[PDB]
Design a protein around this motif. Structure first.
Motif, PDB file in Angstrom:
ATOM      1  N   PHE B 266       0.849  -1.188   0.000  1.00 13.74           N
ATOM      2  CA  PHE B 266       0.000   0.000   0.000  1.00 13.74           C
ATOM      3  C   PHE B 266       0.885   1.238   0.000  1.00 13.74           C
ATOM      4  CE2 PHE B 266      -2.836  -3.218   1.779  1.00 13.74           C
ATOM      5  CZ  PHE B 266      -3.968  -3.012   1.023  1.00 13.74           C
ATOM      6  N   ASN B 413      -4.219  -1.039   9.723  1.00 13.06           N
ATOM      7  CA  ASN B 413      -4.109  -2.308   9.013  1.00 13.06           C
ATOM      8  C   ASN B 413      -3.052  -2.247   7.917  1.00 13.06           C
ATOM      9  OD1 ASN B 413      -4.627  -4.929   8.354  1.00 13.06           O
ATOM     10  ND2 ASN B 413      -6.756  -4.615   7.719  1.00 13.06           N
ATOM     11  N   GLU B 414      -2.994  -1.136   7.182  1.00 12.83           N
ATOM     12  CA  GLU B 414      -2.030  -1.034   6.094  1.00 12.83           C
ATOM     13  C   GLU B 414      -0.601  -1.105   6.613  1.00 12.83           C
ATOM     14  OE1 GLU B 414      -5.035   1.144   5.626  1.00 12.83           O
ATOM     15  OE2 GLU B 414      -5.515  -0.744   4.618  1.00 12.83           O
ATOM     16  N   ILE B 417       0.286  -4.657   7.546  1.00 14.02           N
ATOM     17  CA  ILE B 417       0.457  -5.446   6.327  1.00 14.02           C
ATOM     18  C   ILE B 417       1.824  -5.173   5.708  1.00 14.02           C
ATOM     19  CG2 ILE B 417      -0.255  -5.480   3.916  1.00 14.02           C
ATOM     20  CD1 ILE B 417      -3.116  -5.656   4.820  1.00 14.02           C
TER      21      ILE B 417
HETATM   22  C1  LIG Z   1      -7.867  -3.728   7.500  1.00 15.56           C
HETATM   23  O1  LIG Z   1      -8.934  -4.019   8.403  1.00 15.56           O
HETATM   24  C2  LIG Z   1     -10.049  -3.121   8.302  1.00 15.56           C
HETATM   25  C3  LIG Z   1     -11.034  -3.531   9.370  1.00 15.56           C
HETATM   26  O2  LIG Z   1     -12.327  -3.001   9.115  1.00 15.56           O
HETATM   27  C4  LIG Z   1     -10.637  -3.181   6.896  1.00 15.56           C
HETATM   28  O3  LIG Z   1     -11.680  -2.219   6.784  1.00 15.56           O
HETATM   29  C5  LIG Z   1      -9.558  -2.899   5.860  1.00 15.56           C
HETATM   30  O4  LIG Z   1     -10.084  -3.085   4.552  1.00 15.56           O
HETATM   31  C6  LIG Z   1      -8.369  -3.829   6.066  1.00 15.56           C
HETATM   32  N1  LIG Z   1      -7.309  -3.520   5.120  1.00 15.56           N
HETATM   33  C7  LIG Z   1      -6.641  -4.451   4.429  1.00 15.56           C
HETATM   34  C8  LIG Z   1      -7.042  -5.875   4.679  1.00 15.56           C
HETATM   35  O5  LIG Z   1      -5.752  -4.156   3.636  1.00 15.56           O
END
Ligand SMILES: *[C@@H]1O[C@H](CO)[C@@H](O)[C@H](O)[C@H]1NC(C)=O
Ligand SMILES: CC(=O)N[C@@H]1[C@@H](O)[C@H](O)[C@@H](CO)O[C@H]1O
Ligand SMILES: *[C@@H]1O[C@H](CO)[C@@H](O)[C@H](O)[C@H]1NC(C)=O
Ligand SMILES: *[C@@H]1O[C@H](CO)[C@@H](O)[C@H](O)[C@H]1NC(C)=O
Ligand SMILES: *[C@@H]1O[C@H](CO)[C@@H](O)[C@H](O)[C@H]1NC(C)=O
Ligand SMILES: *[C@@H]1O[C@H](CO)[C@@H](O)[C@H](O)[C@H]1NC(C)=O
Ligand SMILES: *[C@@H]1O[C@H](CO)[C@@H](O)[C@H](O)[C@H]1NC(C)=O
Ligand SMILES: [Cl-]
Lengths: 195, 596
Positions: B266, B413-414, B417
């Motif tokens: 990302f 989350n990004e 990851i």
């Molecule tokens: C990370 O987790 C959130 C939790 O709601 C989600 O909305 C998001 O799309 C996720 N991002 C990813 C998996 O890259």
């Protein structure tokens, strides 16, 4: 009261090896053990037989002293009723000896740069040293069927080994000056008694 | 006329007399790697010559005592190492030539240049050519710039290595071995113990079974990398196929870290970079490892001795001395523990300091064991144990606790990851290449393939499990595996394969006792005194007892598995499966790039 050996036995310049300790018989003197606190910040003062609280008022017949220079890990080995490599081959203490043990660290004097080879400790010995026993003369240890014939080689080694002393060793291998004080009882008018 | 007391006394004399000759020999090397000049190298060599002869003459007398009459196990374990000789087994010619061959290989690897561009640009292998390999973005440039190493150094080193193989095949068989592979694998064999027995033939099956369960993750990552590289470099790298040998950052493909810029999960977001929080808030080099010592104390481990803060070099020389500094942690012998490292204010130095302090504490843990057992349980324990705590210290929870991160910060989350993929690019990018290289080395030491087909099989059976293709053929005129430094200098490569598995099992076993609930990639081990005691139980064991007993003590499972490793990378697999929905995972080895 008049230059008792209790100070002149600690400020000696050169000490002896662990197997040739210089025993000294203490003659008539006053047993002021609280003035020894004015000689250096001792590392070990714990002592057995009699609690230190009662040592202020006591009297005995004659007191004997022994002097060594030893490593750090073997300070706890000088306690009575212990087994090891120096406590059973060079200096063994009686189980119920009613004396006191003092040891303090000396690494700024006993250790020289590029190694100091003037101390020794025995390693090979056939029998077991009985309490309060000494032996200085060395013989080529016989560890083989073939006789030693006065020389070394296979199975015939040299007991004494020089204590490696360097100014960069850890606390474990720092030389520690050790003096052992033991009290004796007899059936004669006593000489040394505390104030 | 005792038959075992003789061995006991001989071992006691060796132990008590081999310490003086070793401490002062190691101190000479330490003084060499602090001011390099004419006198220091002389002193180092003079001190090492006094120990090489002693070690070569003590083995000749230790060999007399038999290993059958002896009964006490801790005596045989010590005596086995000294009984085993080294290069002092071949005759005069086969050693006076082997040493010359080894020195010649070292010299010819050290010396090397190429002239692709205008005559004035004869760039050597390092550091300019390495930099242009790890930074450029082209195809013809990389191809015509690094066709040189695999076609000049390889040609130089063909005949000497061909002779070396047959010269050292008849060196292990002197010491009751089948081939050099047996000698290499003997580092793990432990016998004479009931229910703890691990033959050389079992390690092959263990490795072949361990490699089978990491294939799905590697295949998914390979598909993702190929999909990205198709976008980055156009008109090349067919959408389905294998990757070219070059173009993968590092030359030999050992690491995949230099492709992080090429493949980012990302974009437009910043990763955690704690380097300005260490700059605006003043923080010097001493506290950098003072706080690390604080952490080691918090995990309930002993302090560091005073014989470490007075003499150890921990910063730039700054006094006119010339020294080449790489992060190490020496163990000089009787109570001395020193660390030499050039320190700068970044994360890299911080994590490196954590690693070096961790493994120097490991070294200090077993100080009570005799001289012959002052080592790790096997050759892979030191690096893995050191790396476990570096990994555990990289979490954002511990960083926030130490005050380096903003209190009002929530891990997105990004960012997690990106962190997971950044670790994966460097961790799982070396496993299938290391297994490849070690398998080829073993299979060529056993003499399974003829000497007329050395590189053809190498490329053909590397394209299968690594899936890396090579431009243009090499008809047994280009010694390709010779380019690596470890291959040329005869260094073991299995340690790197097993270190990752060991550390990933250790991390899970250690953090299960710490009572952490949640994910495993943000797990932290601090303020966990009982966990520290559990780890110290294994650390203090030393090499007296066979390494699998240490494994059972720390974890409780005899064999090594990848399920603890797969637990770390479960979220990565879950995300990557969703990312790849219109791509075809696989490296079908049909297409070739050398079609003119
Ligand atoms: C990370 O987790 C959130 C939790 O709601 C989600 O909305 C998001 O799309 C996720 N991002 C990813 C998996 O890259
Ligand atoms: C962001 C940064 O680097 N520094 C800031 C800047 O406002 C100044 O240099 C100083 C004010 O206290 O410190 C802070
Ligand atoms: C033994 O004691 C005597 C009397 O104090 C002393 O003169 C002699 O020097 C001592 N031995 C050593 C090792 O100094
Ligand atoms: C030892 O001798 C020196 C010199 O006389 C003296 O300064 C020191 O006080 C003595 N040691 C003691 C009793 O602390
Ligand atoms: C530089 O070399 C000198 C040689 O005399 C020696 O003291 C040491 O190796 C180095 N000295 C310092 C201060 O780094
Ligand atoms: C082997 O000898 C050591 C002493 O060197 C001893 O501590 C140990 O108990 C012996 N092994 C066994 C199985 O008793
Ligand atoms: C350990 O406990 C102390 C208690 O004050 C705390 O400040 C510190 O952050 C803890 N370390 C962690 C959570 O890593
Ligand atoms: Cl390749």
């Amino acid at each position: 009261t008049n230059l008792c050996p209790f100070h002149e036995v600690f400020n000696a310049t050169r000490f002896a090896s662990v197997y040739a300790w210089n025993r000294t018989r203490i003659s008539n003197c006053v047993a002021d053990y609280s003035v020894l606190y004015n000689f250096a910040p001792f590392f070990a003062f714990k002592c057995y037989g009699v609690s230190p609280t009662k040592l202020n008022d006591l009297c005995f017949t004659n007191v004997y002293a022994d002097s060594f220079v030893i490593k750090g890990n073997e300070v706890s080995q000088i306690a009575p009723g212990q087994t090891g490599n120096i406590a059973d081959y060079n200096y063994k203490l009686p189980d119920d000896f009613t004396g006191c043990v003092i040891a303090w660290n000396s690494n700024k004097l006993d250790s020289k740069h590029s190694g100091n080879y003037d101390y020794w400790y025995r390693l090979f010995r056939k029998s077991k040293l009985k309490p309060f026993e000494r032996d200085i003369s060395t013989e080529i240890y016989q560890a083989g069927n073939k006789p030693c014939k006065g020389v070394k080689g296979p199975n015939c080694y040299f007991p004494l080994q020089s204590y490696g002393f360097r100014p960069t060793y850890g606390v474990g291998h720092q030389p520690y000056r050790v003096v052992v004080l033991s009290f004796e009882l007899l059936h004669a008018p006593a000489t040394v008694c505390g104030p | 006329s005792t038959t075992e007391e003789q061995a006991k006394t001989f071992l006691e004399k060796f132990n008590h007399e081999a310490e003086d000759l070793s401490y002062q020999s190691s101190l000479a090397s330490w003084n060499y790697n602090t001011n390099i000049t004419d006198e220091n190298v002389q002193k180092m060599n003079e001190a090492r010559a006094k120990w090489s002869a002693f070690y070569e003459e003590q083995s000749r007398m230790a060999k007399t005592y038999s290993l059958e009459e002896i009964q006490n196990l801790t005596l045989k374990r010590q005596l086995k190492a000294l009984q085993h000789s080294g290069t002092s087994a071949l005759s005069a010619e086969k050693s006076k030539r082997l040493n010359t061959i080894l020195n010649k290989m070292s010299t010819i690897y050290s010396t090397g240049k190429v002239l692709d561009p205008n005559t004035q640009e004869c760039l050597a292998l390092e550091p300019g050519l390495d930099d242009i390999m790890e930074n450029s973005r082209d195809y013809n440039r990389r191809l015509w710039a690094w066709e040189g190493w695999r076609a000049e150094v390889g040609k130089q080193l063909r005949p000497l290595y061909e002779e070396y193989v047959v010269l050292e095949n008849e060196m292990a068989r002197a010491n009751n071995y089948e081939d050099y592979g047996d000698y290499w694998r003997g580092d793990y064999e432990v016998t004479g113990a009931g229910d703890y027995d691990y033959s050389r033939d079992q390690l092959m099956k263990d490795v072949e079974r361990t490699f089978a369960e990491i294939k799905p993750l590697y295949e998914q990552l390979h598909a993702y990398v190929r999909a990205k590289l198709m976008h980055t470099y156009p008109s090349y790298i067919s959408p389905t196929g294998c990757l070219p040998a070059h173009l993968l950052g590092d030359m030999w493909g050992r690491f995949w870290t230099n492709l992080y810029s090429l493949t980012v999960p990302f974009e437009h977001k910043p990763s955690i970079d704690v380097t300005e929080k260490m700059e605006n808030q003043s923080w010097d080099a001493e506290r950098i490892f003072k706080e690390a010592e604080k952490f080691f104390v918090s995990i309930s481990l002993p302090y560091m001795t005073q014989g470490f803060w007075d003499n150890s070099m921990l910063t730039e020389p700054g006094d006119g001395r010339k020294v080449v500094c790489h992060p190490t942690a020496w163990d000089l012998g009787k109570g001395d523990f020193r660390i030499k490292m050039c320190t700068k204010v970044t994360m890299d130095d911080f994590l490196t300091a954590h690693h070096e302090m961790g493994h120097i504490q490991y070294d200090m843990a077993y100080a009570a064991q005799p001289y012959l057992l002052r080592n790790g349980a096997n050759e892979g324990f030191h690096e893995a144990v050191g790396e476990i705590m570096s990994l555990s210290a990289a979490t954002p929870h511990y960083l926030k606790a130490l005050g380096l991160l903003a209190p009002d910060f929530h891990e997105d989350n990004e960012t997690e990851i990106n962190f997971l993929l950044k670790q994966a690019l460097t961790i799982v990018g070396t496993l299938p290449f290391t297994y490849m290289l070690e398998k080829w080395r073993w299979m060529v030491f056993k003499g399974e393939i003829p000497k007329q087909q050395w590189m053809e099989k190498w490329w053909e059976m590397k394209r299968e499990i690594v899936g890396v293709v090579e431009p243009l053929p090499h008809d047994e005129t280009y010694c390709d595996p010779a380019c690596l430094f470890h291959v040329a200098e005869d260094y073991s490569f299995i340690r790197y394969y097993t270190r990752t598995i060991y550390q990933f099992q250790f991390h899970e076993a250690l953090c299960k006792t710490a009572k952490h609930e949640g994910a495993l990639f943000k797990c932290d081990i601090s303020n966990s005194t009982e966990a520290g005691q559990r780890l110290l139980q294994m650390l203090r064991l030393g090499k007296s007892e066979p390494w699998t007993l240490a494994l059972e003590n720390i974890v409780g499972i005899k064999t090594m598995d990848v399920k603890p490793l797969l637990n770390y990378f479960e979220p990565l697999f879950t995300w990557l499966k969703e990312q790849n929905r219109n791509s075809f995972v696989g490296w079908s080895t049909e297409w070739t790039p050398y079609s003119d």
